Amino acid sequence: QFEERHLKFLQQLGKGNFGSVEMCRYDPLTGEVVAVKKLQHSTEEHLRDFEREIEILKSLQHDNIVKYKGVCYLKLIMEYLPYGSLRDYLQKHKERIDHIKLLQYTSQICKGMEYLGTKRYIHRDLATRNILVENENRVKIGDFGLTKVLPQDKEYYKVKSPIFWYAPESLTESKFSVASDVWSFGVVLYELFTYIEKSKSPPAEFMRMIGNDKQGQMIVFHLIELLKNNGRLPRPDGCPDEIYMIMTECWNNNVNQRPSFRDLALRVDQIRDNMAGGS
Ligand SMILES: CCS(=O)(=O)N1CC(CC#N)(n2cc(-c3ncnc4[nH]ccc34)cn2)C1
């Protein structure tokens, strides 16, 4: 474990309404820099969920999943990835990030999700805000606060919300599955190829398609109707048609028709290889 007496707060990395992450120096004896996740508005339910999240991350060992380091007395300690979220990184470096590089990040996210599927985990929160950048060549899935373990007897989990990333059956039945993670991956791919431009973000695009007359519950209603009538996010400027087609396959209303992460990884890798080779 970690001795809090040797943890010095250096910078806030994220301050949510139910959790926060701090950059702290752990110097037990010049020491190391670590990322420290703590609970905000800690209720008995929230601490129970945080305990399970801790256990889920400790069980994960993958190049594209943020590294668990341990716990402190209750705080979650990991590594400090110094380039922050992919949102900040892509915004800052967009002029230098070509499509071959976007597909490198896409492939890495895909392989992390592939690995999560092996353990029958549903992430439920796949979005660029939850992808961290270690260096210019490696990103990692960085947060698992909504992740669920599928029950032994079902291939979905029902849960009582980032609605603009949600599959239709998550919006209607509160059902989450690998296939609804694939839907959200399609939205991540859209985020990447819009270079995280806020006026092109999923919430901005969907509200323009719906109408900004709506508020709260009615937004969800017209989003469901929109998706049921096959309204979809548009092809981002400059986005290759083959990549948009993958997005649209992830966004199939028919759950059975969405691709697997294994197949997504294979195709993304092939497209990137063809792009780099000039074929
Ligand atoms: C849900 C509220 S939050 O503030 O806890 N949340 C985690 C969050 C999203 C992700 N991943 N975040 C993580 C970091 C981060 N940066 C640098 N190294 C790191 N290691 C582990 C996390 C991490 C910064 N913001 C934002």
From Swiss-Prot:
Changing residue 37 to E: Loss of ability to up-regulate potassium voltage-gated channel activity of KCNA3. ATP binds at residues 13-21, 37. It is found in: Endomembrane system; Cytoplasm; Nucleus. Autophosphorylated, leading to regulate its activity. Autophosphorylation on Tyr-26, Tyr-115 and Tyr-121 in response to growth hormone (GH) are required for maximal kinase activity. Also phosphorylated by TEC. Phosphorylated on tyrosine residues in response to interferon gamma signaling. Phosphorylated on tyrosine residues in response to a signaling cascade that is activated by increased cellular retinol. Undergoes Notch-induced ubiquitination and subsequent proteasomal degradation which is mediated by ASB1 or ASB2, the substrate-recognition components of probable ECS E3 ubiquitin-protein ligase complexes. The modification Phosphotyrosine is found at residues 26, 115, 121, 156-157. It comes from the Eukaryota. Ubiquitously expressed throughout most tissues. The active site is at residue 125. It is linked to Chromosomal aberrations involving JAK2 are found in both chronic and acute forms of eosinophilic, lymphoblastic and myeloid leukemia. Translocation t(8;9)(p22;p24) with PCM1 links the protein kinase domain of JAK2 to the major portion of PCM1. Translocation t(9;12)(p24;p13) with ETV6. Interacts with EPOR, LYN, SIRPA, SH2B1 and TEC. Interacts with IL23R. Interacts with SKB1. Interacts with STAM2. Interacts with IFNGR2 (via intracellular domain). Interacts with LEPR (Isoform B). Interacts with HSP90AB1; promotes functional activation in a heat shock-dependent manner. Interacts with STRA6. Interacts with RHEX; this interaction occurs in a erythropoietin (EPO)-dependent manner. Interacts with ASB2; the interaction targets JAK2 for Notch-induced proteasomal degradation. Interacts with MPL/TPOR. Belongs to the protein kinase superfamily. Tyr protein kinase family. JAK subfamily. Possesses 2 protein kinase domains. The second one probably contains the catalytic domain, while the presence of slight differences suggest a different role for protein kinase 1. Non-receptor tyrosine kinase involved in various processes such as cell growth, development, differentiation or histone modifications. Mediates essential signaling events in both innate and adaptive immunity. In the cytoplasm, plays a pivotal role in signal transduction via its association with type I receptors such as growth hormone (GHR), prolactin (PRLR), leptin (LEPR), erythropoietin (EPOR), thrombopoietin receptor (MPL/TPOR); or type II receptors including IFN-alpha, IFN-beta, IFN-gamma and multiple interleukins. This is Tyrosine-protein kinase JAK2. It comes from Homo sapiens. The gene is JAK2. The chain holds residues 843 to 1132 of 1132 of the full protein.
